[PDB]
Amino acid sequence: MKRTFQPSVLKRNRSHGFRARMATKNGRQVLARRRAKGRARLTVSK
Amino acid sequence: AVVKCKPTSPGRRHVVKVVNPELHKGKPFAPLLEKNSKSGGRNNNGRITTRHIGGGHKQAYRIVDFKRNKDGIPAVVERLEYDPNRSANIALVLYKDGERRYILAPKGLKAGDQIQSGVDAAIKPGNTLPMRNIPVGSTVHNVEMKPGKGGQLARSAGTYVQIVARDGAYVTLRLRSGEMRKVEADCRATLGEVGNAEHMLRVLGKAGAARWRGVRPTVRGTAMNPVDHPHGGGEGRNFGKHPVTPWGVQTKGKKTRSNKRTDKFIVRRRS
RNA sequence: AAUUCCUUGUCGGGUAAGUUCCGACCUGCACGAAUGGCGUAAUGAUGGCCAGGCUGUCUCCACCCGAGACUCAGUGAAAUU
RNA sequence: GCUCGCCGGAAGACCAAGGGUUCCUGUCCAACGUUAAUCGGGGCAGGGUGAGUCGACCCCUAAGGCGAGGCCGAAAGGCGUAGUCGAUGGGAAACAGGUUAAUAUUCCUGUACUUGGUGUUACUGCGAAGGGGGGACGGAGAAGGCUAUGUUGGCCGGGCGACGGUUGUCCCGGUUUAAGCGUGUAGGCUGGUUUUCCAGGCAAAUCCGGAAAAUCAAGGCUGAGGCGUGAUGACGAGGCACUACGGUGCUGAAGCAACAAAUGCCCUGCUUCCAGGAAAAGCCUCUAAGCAUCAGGUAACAUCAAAUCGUACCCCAAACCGACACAGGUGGUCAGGUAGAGAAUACCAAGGCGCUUGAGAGAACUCGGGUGAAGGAACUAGGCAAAAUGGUGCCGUAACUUCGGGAGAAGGCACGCUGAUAUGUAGGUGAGGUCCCUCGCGGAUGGAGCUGAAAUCAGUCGAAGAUACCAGCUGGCUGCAACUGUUUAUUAAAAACACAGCACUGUGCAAACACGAAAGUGGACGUAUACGGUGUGACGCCUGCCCGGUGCCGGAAGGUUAAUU
RNA sequence: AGGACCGAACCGACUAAUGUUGAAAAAUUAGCGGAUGACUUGUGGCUGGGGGUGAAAGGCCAAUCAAACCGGGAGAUAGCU
């Protein structure tokens, strides 16, 4: 049976990539929150 | 000619088709072609604004000369062609200088005929002249609402317009719907009428034929739930309310014209 | 009657015996003409009924071929209390 | 190591997506592996991915995204022009053989090809963010000509039999070779050359389009395969020396013909139909502003350059998505033999596997199967389940019907093997010879060889000849929906939803209507034979009476009535 | 010629048995329907929560739908256990 997760690198970067987050005001706030918490991995870029 | 297929299988019992052997069987004129992508009834917001649109066969757009301002140069028609973008047919016309264009095909026009446009032009079908020089009581088609804007009336398969009378800088016309409209006596018109009257005698015969044209199925509305349509549901088939559209309008005689900007060129709207 | 409460209405057909099925009758509790009425060849993994063929479905169960169940060695769960 | 069993349109082979050292060698057995373990996709250490031609990057664009000025909006922000991004599509160039424990069209041997920079020489009208050509396109169907590939004969090497026969019409194996260059065939499309003139292609034009004459019909373009060369080469069954029996050097015969034949190629072709079938650049041409003894353009020769990143391994699965070494899911390419209509089915080749707990016993009962005396639905809510029918040819076939159907209706007869007609028939293929010729990959005649259905007659074996796998049960009456289709992923597939057809009603274009505080967009590059909404639901015969109530469409005297004054 | 006929690949899910701390949080085995079209499939793109999409079941929107998920108002309120 087919399951929900079907990986694709190109689609992953276009949806949650670093450049996608920086392109919108609300996306920039996501980075600020994660930086304050001290996350080691900011996004899914690598 | 109209031909009915034999009943060799269901879905072909009731099929009636219109066949015209005079139409050209070949590729069209490449220089006058353009692409045309489907929309699906969705606007730039991505939402559906018109329902029952989707699918169909791929089509290419043909540039047609509605303005018809090439005056004083005789032209000869070459061949007739099938246009998928409209119900009427089109004709390829070659001018004396050497330029080619597309025009709507009148009723009595065939290969080898001669047409011309302008005030000096003669009173023959396929000729375009200002309505000021057109004798009253004649039949015309492809009429312009404003001078130099291009024709916008009587462009269907077998429609036409008749000039009733003229008094000043205006003329009175009777439209196919029965309305009597007043327009400036400087617009252009073409003698005759669009020849495809057999277009309305065809019958699709099966559901698949409609899908070929890009029409999606329609859901009545009394078969939905209350949260979807005002006609709602019920235990069985109740329908105990006045007929109404989605969004709640009577749609059983209520009028919707509320322009009021012109409200001056209309005399005998209809009926 | 996909509609009939009284009801297994009454008569005829099919069965040794038919509250179902088919054909008539009209007392239509409470059918009816585009929220359509009455017919209709073909089509349907659609509802009801009757025949031929065929059989372990049954009268009534018997034997046989394989995988578990049982014994020995290794590993080693669960609900509940 | 020798036997046995299983898959073989895969349970074989090569990739994309995804994963990220699981790849090769040495060494170890605590934990991990549903048991043991010397073994492992486990622990530890070392080693392994070689490109001008393959892919990415790069040039060009589709849906769509972003968007200088600009338009709009309390703020945030929305839409969009010039532009700039975005493959799942278009765009130059390499093949065969050998080699490592682990990589190769990337290394080595042999033989090729493409695009640029500079120099020399010869001859010269060069120039674009502009014009034209080209690139460039659908479904179905029907043939003809070919190849991959297979079978048989010939040729070459080897063999004479564990038990009767086997020197022959006997047995086993092999019989392979590319890109490139030259030749331009089967076949497809189109009439050429010269001169003069012109309201068109935003200006120009020798180019494209149009008009009028003259003169000839051979002009051009596209094009599978075959043949020659590449090749005195490479490969090659088996022998013979090394050979830690893990494996290496050397040597090496024959290497042809006929027949059958694709879903692949000629074919982006041809015929036909209605629903009428992308864009841009590279490429080929034409000139403007300019520059002209310069600079540039065409051809030959020489020389230099072609960077950077990916390349191991699995990839229908133990390495990817399912918490697992999980009877699940996952796109493309390759397609042998016998029987067969077949990519179905049965048995096999190349190749790969026996699925990570075993050994005994032969109770009840449960699960998956085989056979059955006499009766044959008496079972049960119900013939649920099971049993049964099953192929090809010929004969034959009802009510009803929209004349197409119903229909494979129902039912009946014949099927193996051997010989003859005919030492292999009808048919297909086709050498030599002969003849012709625009002498070429040509035409006519000619028939050797090869391959090969079906039918009739006679004989013969068994209980049974469509013998296995494979492979329709049939008929009569009736309700509902016309029909093919669609639906509650995971208890409902239907009489429910769609449907062609029919009717009412709205809408004259800046259309009605819909998404949006707005700009704007869809409807539509459409125009009443058009578009939106509502009910009914093929087709045939038909669709009666009622306008008091509610809604909608008109009318207008009189009564009543807001802000304002 | 055909939303034509028989039947594999491919796409579906009408009947029965097994399984129900399953091999599997919806499968396996034997039969079954469509199979040139209103057909099926790979890659990328667009529509966002009182909103989307819907050949219309209150179906589907990441194993969750008569109003998704995450954080916040928040120690909401609870004459009831």
Swiss-Prot record, chain A:
<dbReference type="Pfam" id="PF00468">
    <property type="entry name" value="Ribosomal_L34"/>
</dbReference>
<dbReference type="InterPro" id="IPR020939">
    <property type="entry name" value="Ribosomal_bL34_CS"/>
</dbReference>
<dbReference type="GO" id="GO:0005840">
    <property type="term" value="C:ribosome"/>
</dbReference>
<keyword id="KW-0687">Ribonucleoprotein</keyword>
<dbReference type="InterPro" id="IPR000271">
    <property type="entry name" value="Ribosomal_bL34"/>
</dbReference>
<dbReference type="GO" id="GO:0006412">
    <property type="term" value="P:translation"/>
</dbReference>
<protein>
    <recommendedName>
        <fullName>Large ribosomal subunit protein bL34</fullName>
    </recommendedName>
</protein>
<dbReference type="GO" id="GO:0003735">
    <property type="term" value="F:structural constituent of ribosome"/>
</dbReference>
<comment type="similarity">
    <text>Belongs to the bacterial ribosomal protein bL34 family.</text>
</comment>
<keyword id="KW-0689">Ribosomal protein</keyword>
<dbReference type="GO" id="GO:1990904">
    <property type="term" value="C:ribonucleoprotein complex"/>
</dbReference>
Swiss-Prot record, chain B:
<protein>
    <recommendedName>
        <fullName>Large ribosomal subunit protein uL2</fullName>
    </recommendedName>
</protein>
<comment type="function">
    <text>In the E.coli 70S ribosome in the initiation state it has been modeled to make several contacts with the 16S rRNA (forming bridge B7b, PubMed:12809609); these contacts are broken in the model with bound EF-G.</text>
</comment>
<dbReference type="GO" id="GO:0032297">
    <property type="term" value="P:negative regulation of DNA-templated DNA replication initiation"/>
</dbReference>
<dbReference type="GO" id="GO:0008270">
    <property type="term" value="F:zinc ion binding"/>
</dbReference>
<feature type="modified residue" description="N6-acetyllysine">
    <location>
        <position position="241"/>
    </location>
</feature>
<dbReference type="InterPro" id="IPR014722">
    <property type="entry name" value="Rib_uL2_dom2"/>
</dbReference>
<dbReference type="Pfam" id="PF03947">
    <property type="entry name" value="Ribosomal_L2_C"/>
</dbReference>
<keyword id="KW-0699">rRNA-binding</keyword>
<dbReference type="GO" id="GO:0000027">
    <property type="term" value="P:ribosomal large subunit assembly"/>
</dbReference>
<comment type="subunit">
    <text>Part of the 50S ribosomal subunit. Forms a bridge to the 30S subunit in the 70S ribosome, contacting the 16S rRNA. Interacts weakly with S6 in one of the 3.5 A resolved structures. In pull-down experiments interacts with CedA.</text>
</comment>
<dbReference type="GO" id="GO:0003735">
    <property type="term" value="F:structural constituent of ribosome"/>
</dbReference>
<dbReference type="InterPro" id="IPR022671">
    <property type="entry name" value="Ribosomal_uL2_CS"/>
</dbReference>
<dbReference type="GO" id="GO:0022625">
    <property type="term" value="C:cytosolic large ribosomal subunit"/>
</dbReference>
<dbReference type="GO" id="GO:0016740">
    <property type="term" value="F:transferase activity"/>
</dbReference>
<dbReference type="InterPro" id="IPR012340">
    <property type="entry name" value="NA-bd_OB-fold"/>
</dbReference>
<feature type="region of interest" description="Disordered">
    <location>
        <begin position="220"/>
        <end position="271"/>
    </location>
</feature>
<dbReference type="Pfam" id="PF00181">
    <property type="entry name" value="Ribosomal_L2"/>
</dbReference>
<dbReference type="GO" id="GO:0019843">
    <property type="term" value="F:rRNA binding"/>
</dbReference>
<comment type="similarity">
    <text>Belongs to the universal ribosomal protein uL2 family.</text>
</comment>
<keyword id="KW-0689">Ribosomal protein</keyword>
<dbReference type="InterPro" id="IPR005880">
    <property type="entry name" value="Ribosomal_uL2_bac/org-type"/>
</dbReference>
<dbReference type="InterPro" id="IPR014726">
    <property type="entry name" value="Ribosomal_uL2_dom3"/>
</dbReference>
